[PDB]
Amino acid sequence: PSTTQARVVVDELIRGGVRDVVLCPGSRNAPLAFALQDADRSGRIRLHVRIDERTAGYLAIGLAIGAGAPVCVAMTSGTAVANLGPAVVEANYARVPLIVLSANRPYELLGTGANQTMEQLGYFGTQVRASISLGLAEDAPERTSALNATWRSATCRVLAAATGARTANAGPVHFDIPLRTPPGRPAGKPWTYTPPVTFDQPLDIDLSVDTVVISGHGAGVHPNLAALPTVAEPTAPRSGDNPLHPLALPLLRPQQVIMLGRPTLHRPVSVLLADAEVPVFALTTGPRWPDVSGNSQATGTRAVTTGAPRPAWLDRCAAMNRHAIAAVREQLAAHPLTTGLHVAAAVSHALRPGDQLVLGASNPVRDVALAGLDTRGIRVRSNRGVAGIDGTVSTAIGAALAYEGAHERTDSPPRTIALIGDLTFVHDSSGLLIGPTEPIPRSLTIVVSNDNGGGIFELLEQGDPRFSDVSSRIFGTPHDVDVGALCRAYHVESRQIEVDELGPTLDQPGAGMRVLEVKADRSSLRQLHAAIKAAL
Amino acid sequence: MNPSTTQARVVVDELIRGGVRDVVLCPGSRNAPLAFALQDADRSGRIRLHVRIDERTAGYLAIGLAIGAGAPVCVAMTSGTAVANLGPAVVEANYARVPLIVLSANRPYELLGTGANQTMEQLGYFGTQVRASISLGLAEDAPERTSALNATWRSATCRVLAAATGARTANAGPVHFDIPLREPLVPDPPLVTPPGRPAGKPWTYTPPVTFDQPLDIDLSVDTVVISGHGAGVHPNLAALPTVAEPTAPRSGDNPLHPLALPLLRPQQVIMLGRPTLHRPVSVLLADAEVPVFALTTGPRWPDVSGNSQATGTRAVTTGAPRPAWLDRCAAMNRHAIAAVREQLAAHPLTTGLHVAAAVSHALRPGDQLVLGASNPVRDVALAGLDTRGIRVRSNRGVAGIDGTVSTAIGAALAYEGAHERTDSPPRTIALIGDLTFVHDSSGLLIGPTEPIPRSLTIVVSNDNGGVSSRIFHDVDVGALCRAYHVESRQIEVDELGPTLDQGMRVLEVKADRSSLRQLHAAIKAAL
Amino acid sequence: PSTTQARVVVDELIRGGVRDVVLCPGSRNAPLAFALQDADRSGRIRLHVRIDERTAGYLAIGLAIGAGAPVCVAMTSGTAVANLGPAVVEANYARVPLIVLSANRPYELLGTGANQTMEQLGYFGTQVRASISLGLAERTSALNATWRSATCRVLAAATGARTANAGPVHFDIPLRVTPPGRPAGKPWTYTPPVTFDQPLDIDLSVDTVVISGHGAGVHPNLAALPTVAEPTAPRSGDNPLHPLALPLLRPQQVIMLGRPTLHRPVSVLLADAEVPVFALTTGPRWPDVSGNSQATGTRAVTTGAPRPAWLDRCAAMNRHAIAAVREQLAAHPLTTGLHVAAAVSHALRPGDQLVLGASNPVRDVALAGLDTRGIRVRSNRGVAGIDGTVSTAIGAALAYEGAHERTGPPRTIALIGDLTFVHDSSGLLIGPTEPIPRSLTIVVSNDNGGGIFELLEQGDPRFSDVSSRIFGTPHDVDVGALCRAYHVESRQIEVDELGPTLDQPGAGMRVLEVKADRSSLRQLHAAIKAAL
Ligand SMILES: Cc1ncc(C[n+]2csc(CCOP(=O)(O)OP(=O)(O)O)c2C)c(N)n1
Ligand SMILES: Cc1ncc(C[n+]2csc(CCOP(=O)(O)OP(=O)(O)O)c2C)c(N)n1
Ligand SMILES: O=C(O)c1cc(O)c2ccccc2c1O
Ligand SMILES: O=C(O)c1cc(O)c2ccccc2c1O
Ligand SMILES: O=C(O)c1cc(O)c2ccccc2c1O
Ligand SMILES: [Mg+2]
Ligand SMILES: [Mg+2]
């Protein structure tokens, strides 16, 4: 009955490329729970069990962005929708193939004097690419074949919407399997096959006009833009090797901007993208496109270029790039205290091709860009879809698990190194709790630049000295957490170290999961950035 | 100029730059800034304004102006139930992939919850039916912010346009564009609108996109093509026998009658678009014995009742159909349509099928045909209409009866406008059942100030009919036509063809429902 | 088993007071269709079938406000949700107990590449008081209890039985000798009279005016006060204040009853920060204009009494406003909607049901000074649409006549504009199988366009060149031929004889058309103000 339907869906889901599913024990039995257990023992799919439904959703995001696979999470309780909300919104904005699995009871009253099987909020209506319900399995062995095809093709429709197999717009899907082995295609092929879909929108750009590339989250690779000065966010794949340090951009006067993906960092980027005297061309990989103050002049997916940049423009930007990273390095050297920017510069020098970098929001993701990281050869992950400081520990854990599993399918597994701030760490500290029955990454290291509060607020307008009396409680928000004791409580190896130890410590493989705490200072963060501006 | 006027003129100016050539408008006080702006563009000849009274049928008018020429069409109305009345047209525009922009005026959102007159939860009313629901935001009284506001208003408008036309998604559909407006709502007694791009370019240019998904298919396997609503043109599929719905564009010269399909044994079928029509088409699709390849123009693809091997946008073909297979389908096609034409002539009295055959015999290349989504689209398909060189429209999105008359009027008007931008205008002939005509009879209503189609003939085949089924009317079609001042002459099926050679008129042809069961059974037995 | 379930649910709806259910032919069978057919055959319930789903929704509105009973309408097609939307919005805002019946299918695909059983829009989540689904059908005595309690739940939410906020409810009954209910016809779960009490201390010595709007309650302790009552407000006293007199007075505080929506002077005062406004409503919601309402309640505990001079000043402006309207209507040659409204107002006798369309009609009746005492006045003031007014009158006539018939046939007179009439013209077609009112007269004041815009800013003569096409919207519809096409009795008369025509009974349904002028509306109203 349901059991055959259950095994059919899981089989099709595996054929569709799902390799990881995330579960939490709930009052109701999970949708497909027994079928997933069977598949997990046989080695066809990998289960991850958590108690915290919120960190479990972010765990599923990590398992998806770690290697690009669609990931399932099976809701189990009345609080699951509420707890999965944040990760679903992130999956929508960051275009992450996340399949949320539900199980409705159609023989039960709905909307009356009882808690509902699925406590429904409003976000499913606005966040998901599809909400598909399979419909009740029926006792009909005469029609066994007809239901097999109906179940499997619908599962392919779920996967198609999840991975953007026809829309070029991956994102979350709500897959419902209500509650009261037929074979798939031969050679393991999916039931309904959707080929690679190319979505193409050419755009004429004249490269002789002084041009800068600004690539952000979700940017595509563009070989014909490789030589242009490029301000690339850390999660943006780089097409060339002519980088433009973000602090150098406000000291230049570009006449034309090619904008790749969705930029979210640096105030001078916002100022330039909003400049009515500067044409801005949005090149994206999906149907969506962003704008700053309504200044995007055209949208497309690839450039058709004529002309070539004037060598004086390239030399002027190249000299501005060298000037910018020099001021950063020089005044970090002349700065007596350790700041998060110091920490980010140390992590940047320690990484090597093949690593995976997972960056928290707030200062870490900006600090790494300011330090001049060369992301070539490195996979950079960061939840830029909504830029939350929640769920980052489990994002790194899932991203490391997925990435290490992909390396396995082909030497020791590649390094996954994470740089997050202290609030970010305390937010998702329950992500460290992993039972001995669950998969744990072999080469994950989490670097926590701990300046005992939110350092990025020392740089905004509320960090101005005229607010010094009142800004500590409501923007600084110190906590005095014993990071080492918290890691001890969760049985994860942890050490507090100084900046010079980071490179050596990271090079020496430790336990599968380790937390490297570096005590940083934000008292002097504003003065440090003011000095970096003054050196420019 | 006050904010509401400035904002409404900027919005209408950008919509014209986006290709809007026709706007349907419904009266109201809250939408006065749009109406004022729209009439000026009408008087300057940038658009054609169409005023209607009934929002619901006005939406299907807008649909017709969209499918007749292929352009985005706005419908603008006041706040409250005026917006709810666009519901039915939005559902049809959703499934039919029609670029219908619902341009609603609204009270300031700050009044929602105060009990203000005619103030409801507008934003989001249409839910998932629309491609997007976009609120422009209340216009600030800020003269120094004007240029900035111009950039954001225009950019929002092009987002509305892009979602509605599928400029980047390849999935055209309806879009809700809500505009909160505040007093003053009429232009001030100040005698320049913030400018858009030079040379009439759109604020955010987005070139039409290419969405490609190639599919390996082997034509040596005995194949039949089934092409439904929204199907595309496939030259490498032109030689194969094709069962094509009336609104599906023909790719070749090898037709297959729908009655002939269930008497043949195809080994694979290529499905084009979304087959909505034939009952035998669906019975063969719901068969795991025969593989199905779905070729669509956009991201959507139909539930095949299972057993769809693959979906794509185009075929890459190896091999060629068996000559024997071609001869067999071609024989059965002749046999099926010969059985229809012979039983028709043998039937003593004129039926709905006879009227449909007479219409098809009278069409000629260049004509536009609008069919009611019930029996007319089936009857014409049974008569074997060669839709090549003909534009065939029908609201096959949900196949409702709402707005069928207005859709025909909208399609004629938009079709004629396209011809006008290049001798005498082409003909648009509509075939509507009486119950459908009775239902949307108020869709005939065109105020004396508004455009009437130049060459539109609505053919009503009246058979006085098709626990709720107990209502199945004897409603005078002529009297209805006088009530909305439309010339109507009742005729017979033999005068139809000659008559159609002769502005907007209705030709009622009295038909019989008594003998179709006998007629249809006679066709089944002749196969 | 679903047959038993439907019979149980239909039976519980009868016991819950449902007397009328509206149906539409659609792609699949309606929910409860057979059990509803048996109830209609046996006379326990009255079915009304229409083709137009939108007019069928408003028919249910009429059948609900005509006598206060909960009314069901059963969706049967894909476009049903979309076509029912306008009525459901009105039912939410006007607090009308509308039960929308759905029959979802749990054994079928949902959300896939196919047309859906229900094409869902976004409004159900914003408008309805509840969404209850029964769940698919040896345990028959327990299932009977679950089904009947759930059905009472639906009824309670729709009638505001525990919330005091009646409104629309979505009731889903899934599908792939009948168990009795409580004895003596009692409902399964009894919810007794609920009283939501919220007293407000108001000093009546302060110069006070009362403004009452839609849904206003009756306050015997406010009878003596001057009252600017909207037509659909039940009057508690005998001291009216004409709305045009309001700007000639200086009230010091205002008691606002229900939800007012008419007259700019009412809005201007309700927003005056120097005027305390107390909102007395019958339900949990309360209105505000510009956030000026100082307090809310359900009733007033009063201290003091109005000043004798205040009563006299209000009464004098009241007479002056009545004199201004009556006199200027006499010195105006052409006939307008305001003349037609006055003639209707004088033809009404106690026991009548007056149904007023939006636009000028419901305003003109207020300006004509109609005493609503003894009259049952209906108007779709929830959203003030001009849609669905014909079927609203028809359903209200049917429910009102059915109330009287069960007592041992009062008149329903409708006054609507021409645009309003053309909007819901499809409501005139009723099959011979379907209930038809016996004493419904629809007066159509036809000035070939929307006369209300002649009275607004867009009616200023500076827009005379452009106003007619986009605000007037003339249509030249032959109203006579329209009613003829639907086999509806209709005559076209002058206003001189509309009075007498309404005095002599006619066919069960009849349309009286009075040709009107709107090119002189702005001058007429300007003269009324100049005569004030
Ligand atoms: C879920 C969530 N809550 C609150 C915020 C607001 N916020 C943005 S950055 C930030 C400071 C983060 O502190 P930390 O992790 O210590 O980073 P650093 O101090 O290194 O900047 C906060 C609270 C957010 N982005 N996401
Ligand atoms: C469904 C709907 N659409 C549009 C409007 C806007 N509107 C308000 S009054 C009016 C004119 C009504 O015309 P008519 O029925 O002739 O009344 P008159 O003012 O001429 O008496 C319009 C179009 C509305 N209230 N409801
Ligand atoms: O390019 C992307 O990946 C991307 C992702 C998004 O979530 C967006 C949301 C709004 C607007 C533009 C977006 C966008 O361009
Ligand atoms: O190809 C099309 O045009 C088309 C359009 C649609 O609205 C569909 C809706 C559901 C399922 C398939 C669909 C489809 O194939
Ligand atoms: O009293 C009523 O009948 C009533 C009805 C409504 O629909 C309201 C909506 C918003 C705010 C107040 C409201 C109100 O006071
Ligand atoms: Mg910090
Ligand atoms: Mg009028």
JSON list of C-alpha atoms in Angstrom, two decimals, chain B residues 305-360:
[
{"chain": "B", "resi": 305, "resn": "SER", "atom": "CA", "xyz": [-0.71, 9.99, -16.95]},
{"chain": "B", "resi": 306, "resn": "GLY", "atom": "CA", "xyz": [2.81, 8.61, -16.59]},
{"chain": "B", "resi": 307, "resn": "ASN", "atom": "CA", "xyz": [5.25, 7.02, -19.05]},
{"chain": "B", "resi": 308, "resn": "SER", "atom": "CA", "xyz": [6.91, 10.12, -20.42]},
{"chain": "B", "resi": 309, "resn": "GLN", "atom": "CA", "xyz": [10.44, 9.04, -21.25]},
{"chain": "B", "resi": 310, "resn": "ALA", "atom": "CA", "xyz": [11.74, 12.58, -21.61]},
{"chain": "B", "resi": 311, "resn": "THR", "atom": "CA", "xyz": [10.82, 16.23, -22.02]},
{"chain": "B", "resi": 312, "resn": "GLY", "atom": "CA", "xyz": [12.50, 18.83, -24.16]},
{"chain": "B", "resi": 313, "resn": "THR", "atom": "CA", "xyz": [11.97, 21.73, -26.51]},
{"chain": "B", "resi": 314, "resn": "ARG", "atom": "CA", "xyz": [13.07, 20.26, -29.84]},
{"chain": "B", "resi": 315, "resn": "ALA", "atom": "CA", "xyz": [13.83, 16.91, -31.38]},
{"chain": "B", "resi": 316, "resn": "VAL", "atom": "CA", "xyz": [17.12, 15.81, -32.84]},
{"chain": "B", "resi": 317, "resn": "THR", "atom": "CA", "xyz": [16.03, 13.05, -35.17]},
{"chain": "B", "resi": 318, "resn": "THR", "atom": "CA", "xyz": [17.71, 9.90, -36.45]},
{"chain": "B", "resi": 319, "resn": "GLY", "atom": "CA", "xyz": [16.15, 7.72, -39.11]},
{"chain": "B", "resi": 320, "resn": "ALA", "atom": "CA", "xyz": [12.89, 8.24, -40.96]},
{"chain": "B", "resi": 321, "resn": "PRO", "atom": "CA", "xyz": [9.36, 6.82, -40.63]},
{"chain": "B", "resi": 322, "resn": "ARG", "atom": "CA", "xyz": [8.58, 3.53, -42.33]},
{"chain": "B", "resi": 323, "resn": "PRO", "atom": "CA", "xyz": [6.89, 4.16, -45.71]},
{"chain": "B", "resi": 324, "resn": "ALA", "atom": "CA", "xyz": [4.42, 1.41, -44.80]},
{"chain": "B", "resi": 325, "resn": "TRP", "atom": "CA", "xyz": [3.55, 3.21, -41.57]},
{"chain": "B", "resi": 326, "resn": "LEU", "atom": "CA", "xyz": [2.98, 6.47, -43.44]},
{"chain": "B", "resi": 327, "resn": "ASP", "atom": "CA", "xyz": [0.72, 4.74, -45.99]},
{"chain": "B", "resi": 328, "resn": "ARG", "atom": "CA", "xyz": [-1.25, 3.11, -43.17]},
{"chain": "B", "resi": 329, "resn": "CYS", "atom": "CA", "xyz": [-1.96, 6.32, -41.20]},
{"chain": "B", "resi": 330, "resn": "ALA", "atom": "CA", "xyz": [-2.60, 8.20, -44.43]},
{"chain": "B", "resi": 331, "resn": "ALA", "atom": "CA", "xyz": [-5.12, 5.53, -45.41]},
{"chain": "B", "resi": 332, "resn": "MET", "atom": "CA", "xyz": [-6.84, 5.61, -42.02]},
{"chain": "B", "resi": 333, "resn": "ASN", "atom": "CA", "xyz": [-6.90, 9.41, -42.16]},
{"chain": "B", "resi": 334, "resn": "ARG", "atom": "CA", "xyz": [-8.73, 9.37, -45.50]},
{"chain": "B", "resi": 335, "resn": "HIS", "atom": "CA", "xyz": [-11.05, 6.67, -44.16]},
{"chain": "B", "resi": 336, "resn": "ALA", "atom": "CA", "xyz": [-11.83, 8.59, -40.97]},
{"chain": "B", "resi": 337, "resn": "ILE", "atom": "CA", "xyz": [-12.56, 11.92, -42.60]},
{"chain": "B", "resi": 338, "resn": "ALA", "atom": "CA", "xyz": [-14.41, 10.29, -45.48]},
{"chain": "B", "resi": 339, "resn": "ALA", "atom": "CA", "xyz": [-16.66, 8.59, -42.93]},
{"chain": "B", "resi": 340, "resn": "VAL", "atom": "CA", "xyz": [-17.32, 11.97, -41.30]},
{"chain": "B", "resi": 341, "resn": "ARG", "atom": "CA", "xyz": [-18.07, 13.79, -44.56]},
{"chain": "B", "resi": 342, "resn": "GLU", "atom": "CA", "xyz": [-20.30, 10.98, -45.84]},
{"chain": "B", "resi": 343, "resn": "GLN", "atom": "CA", "xyz": [-22.32, 10.62, -42.64]},
{"chain": "B", "resi": 344, "resn": "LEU", "atom": "CA", "xyz": [-22.71, 14.40, -42.45]},
{"chain": "B", "resi": 345, "resn": "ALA", "atom": "CA", "xyz": [-24.29, 14.51, -45.91]},
{"chain": "B", "resi": 346, "resn": "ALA", "atom": "CA", "xyz": [-26.50, 11.54, -45.03]},
{"chain": "B", "resi": 347, "resn": "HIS", "atom": "CA", "xyz": [-27.83, 13.24, -41.91]},
{"chain": "B", "resi": 348, "resn": "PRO", "atom": "CA", "xyz": [-31.21, 14.85, -42.69]},
{"chain": "B", "resi": 349, "resn": "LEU", "atom": "CA", "xyz": [-30.97, 17.96, -40.50]},
{"chain": "B", "resi": 350, "resn": "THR", "atom": "CA", "xyz": [-28.33, 20.57, -39.70]},
{"chain": "B", "resi": 351, "resn": "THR", "atom": "CA", "xyz": [-26.44, 19.87, -36.49]},
{"chain": "B", "resi": 352, "resn": "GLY", "atom": "CA", "xyz": [-23.70, 21.56, -34.52]},
{"chain": "B", "resi": 353, "resn": "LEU", "atom": "CA", "xyz": [-21.27, 19.51, -36.57]},
{"chain": "B", "resi": 354, "resn": "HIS", "atom": "CA", "xyz": [-22.82, 20.71, -39.83]},
{"chain": "B", "resi": 355, "resn": "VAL", "atom": "CA", "xyz": [-22.43, 24.36, -38.78]},
{"chain": "B", "resi": 356, "resn": "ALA", "atom": "CA", "xyz": [-18.80, 23.69, -37.84]},
{"chain": "B", "resi": 357, "resn": "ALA", "atom": "CA", "xyz": [-18.11, 22.05, -41.20]},
{"chain": "B", "resi": 358, "resn": "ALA", "atom": "CA", "xyz": [-19.72, 25.00, -43.01]},
{"chain": "B", "resi": 359, "resn": "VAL", "atom": "CA", "xyz": [-17.53, 27.49, -41.14]},
{"chain": "B", "resi": 360, "resn": "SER", "atom": "CA", "xyz": [-14.35, 25.57, -41.98]}
]
